[PDB]
Design a protein around this ligand. Structure first.
Ligand SMILES: [Zn+2]
Ligand SMILES: [Zn+2]
Length: 57
C-alpha cells in the first residue's frame, strides 16, 4: 500500500489579503463579511459595501 505523501512546504507566515484595492487603490484594512472579499476604507464607505457588515482585517 503506497501513498502520495509528497508535497512542498508553504513559507510566508504573513497575510496577503490586505494589499491594495484595484478600484480606489487604498490600503486594504477591512473585509466585507457579506461578500467575503478584502476591501479598503473607500469601499466600506461606498454604498457598495456600506450596508454590508465590514470588519477590520
Ligand atoms: Zn476600494
Ligand atoms: Zn460587500
Amino acid at each position: 500500500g503506497s501513498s502520495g505523501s509528497s508535497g512542498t512546504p508553504g513559507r510566508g507566515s504573513r497575510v496577503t489579503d490586505q494589499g491594495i484595492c484595484p478600484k480606489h487603490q487604498e490600503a486594504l484594512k477591512l473585509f466585507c463579511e457579506v461578500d467575503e472579499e478584502a476591501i479598503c476604507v473607500v469601499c466600506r464607505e461606498s454604498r457598495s459595501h456600506k450596508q454590508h457588515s465590514v470588519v477590520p482585517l
